[PDB]
Amino acid sequence: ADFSLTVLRARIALLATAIGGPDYTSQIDPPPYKLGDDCLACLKDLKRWFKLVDDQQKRWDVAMAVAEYRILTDDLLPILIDWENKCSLAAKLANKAYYDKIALNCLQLLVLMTWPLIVTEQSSSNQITLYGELKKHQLVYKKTILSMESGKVLRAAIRLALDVIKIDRLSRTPRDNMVLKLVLNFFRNVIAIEPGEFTINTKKSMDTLPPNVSMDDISLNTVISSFHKNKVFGFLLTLTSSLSKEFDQDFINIPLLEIMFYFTKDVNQELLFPRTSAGFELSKLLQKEHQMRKNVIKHTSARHSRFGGLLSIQTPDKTRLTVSGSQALVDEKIALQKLDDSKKWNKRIIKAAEGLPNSLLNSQTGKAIFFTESNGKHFKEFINNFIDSGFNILLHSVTNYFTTEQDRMVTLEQVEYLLFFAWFVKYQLLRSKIDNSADIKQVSEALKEVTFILVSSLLRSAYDLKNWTVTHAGMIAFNELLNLVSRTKAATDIEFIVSRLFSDERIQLLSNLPKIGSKYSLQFMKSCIELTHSVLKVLEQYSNFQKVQANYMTEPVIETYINFLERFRELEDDSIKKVFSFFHRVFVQAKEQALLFRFDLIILLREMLSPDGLDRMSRSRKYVSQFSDYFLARLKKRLKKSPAWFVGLLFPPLHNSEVGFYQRY
Amino acid sequence: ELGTSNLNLDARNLLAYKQTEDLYHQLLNYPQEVISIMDQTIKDCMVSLIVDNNLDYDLDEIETKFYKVRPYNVGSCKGMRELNPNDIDKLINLKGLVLRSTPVIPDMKVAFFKCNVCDHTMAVEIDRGVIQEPARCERIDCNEPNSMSLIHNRCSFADKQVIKLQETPDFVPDGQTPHSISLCVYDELVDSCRAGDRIEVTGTFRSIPIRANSRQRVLKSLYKTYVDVVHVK
């Protein structure tokens, strides 16, 4: 009942004072807090309220109670920070166990309250009710923990680790090893808490930061500054790099994978390399704004909106139409477009991924996140030392785990592994592209045979069961491996690895993959394109080839390419270079001209080539106009030789045996 | 070379040149279309001069500007009381004295929309006084109904003013008092004229309906009339 609920809330509130309090003799305005008794029992019973009740009833009500009484912010942080600062001063000089006991048990609650949140069709209605609100409260937690004394609780958590670093692994009991798992398990949460995702019941078709929270409190930029001052990055670096020497790998190296995922996520590598500067580029951007303004002006009438006359347009067969406005009098292109634009209907439309936190897989990544200069250089230093120090030893362990455990996996661990591989391999390639001090040997553990098998196997199994999110990530990982191979061939075993990578079975898979992309989201198709470009380019420099290229060329691939190309207002300068490379391959080299004589391509080239779309001076117009010229020349030749193609141009090609051969050629 | 945008034109020159003898009549009978044609002719000619004579002037600057013709000396002046319903939408010429001018009124020309959920934006063209609001948000992944909304202070506006013109005593009927007519004037010509000024004008003689109440589309049978000036002298 409501009264039983508030009785438990009141029980918690009383426990929220039995804990202790600051001293009003002190005349120190204010002092720190001061300590209660039964407090062991207080902490333990709170732990029981989580584990023995809320978990067993699947509620999150208990968390709502502790959030009501602000336990984290009010007691746990000063209890820990006082323990830390006391022991720090004692170390400067250079029952006490009971104090240390309290330090352990306060931290374990911090891990529990900030643990990240999952919702399914098997979660209770209680949890589904409370999801949106507890998100707000966890955001408050992240801000607070990073703020206190400029984040000094984070020194307490690592000092706890330092006690268990201390003495030889040969001594270290299972209970002892849990501390070293626990500490790293904390930092994962502090990075993982981020602004909410809005969710509603789909009964009818019709921000969540609380008043005390703002973006600069919560941004990844902040977290960098906070960890650096409070001495975390040294701990993650030392701990990962000596990992091979007999720290029991089993307890550390998955939590330590999740950290690296959880703050590589949302960085584009180009933002870490530069390739008054801000003001200069701002001025240039204002020039671009002026061009857009000019485009609007070129469609704007001189005289006002009620001056306008009326226009009539007569067709062949003497039938007439009517359009209004003063620009229609002079511009037939505009009149024709304006005529169709009035018409009401649009055909309604069809729509791939859920269950996991925001990442490259389901967001448009043409949108950076933003760094102070000190933060930029500190972050660059952290991951550069990580790569030069830790990467091979980490990947070798985590991969030779997962080969023995693949059957037992869960979707998240698959998507973590495939987006840790991808990031670090790409970033190193870019860094050594830039400079000679860097080298490729640092990432060279990715190529050895076991990992290649494992990325292959993940992609295989994901594709067969029609799990499209793992398939998407696996596509991204398998792209980079191929990219790295072409690098190393441009310098023995690598050719053996290629020959095994391009057994016939895999060519069947990698040929299959663009065909299904037509239905799905804009990123999926983009992954398919970039993988295809790489896949063909390697086999070009193998010297088989004619068998493989004919395997790619057919109607359902071309359909995907156009369906992707028409959203060009959103895409990069580089991706369109890739698409026209492929059309050059289909049209000129392979001489399979009949695929592209289809009408929705001819519309597209007008839009994109018009004064509407692609800029008059972008590099894209060089490629596009050089393509269309050749297109229309060959089309002219075909149409005059055989006039039936006028009715051909609307429809798909015709698959009958007796007429179809002459049709295609 | 003076950086200016309007060209005077006395209509008698259209009668002197043989190829435009009929264009003179078409101007009086169809002003709204013919004047627009003349505007887009002048702008193109200005561009042609700099590109043909290959001069140093910025093509973008000329493309950005609006150019307008202002015809005048069209024919005999017409008595204010003798305008009849067969003169609607034809060019007229009037003489008179200025009584008063209202302050400048902002007139909207372009509307600005923003999506409430995904922050997509669209600029829309105003014609015939009606805002062509979109049915759904046009961003592909945010194809939602009622999702766009108007932002007043990011629209674009233009100046309108109303001038009250009185009949000159030379035309008043015997034993009667002079009448007056209202002139609508835009952009360049807005603040030109003061109380007590004596002028001659040229503009289309227009008429429009008026509503019975502000709640509903019900119109009255009598129509309001006014003059839409394109030149003042």
Partner: peptide
């Protein structure tokens, strides 16, 4: 219940 996230929300 037909719970659903605003997966498309990215501004």
């Amino acid at each position: 219940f037909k719970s659903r996230a605003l997966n498309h929300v990215k501004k």
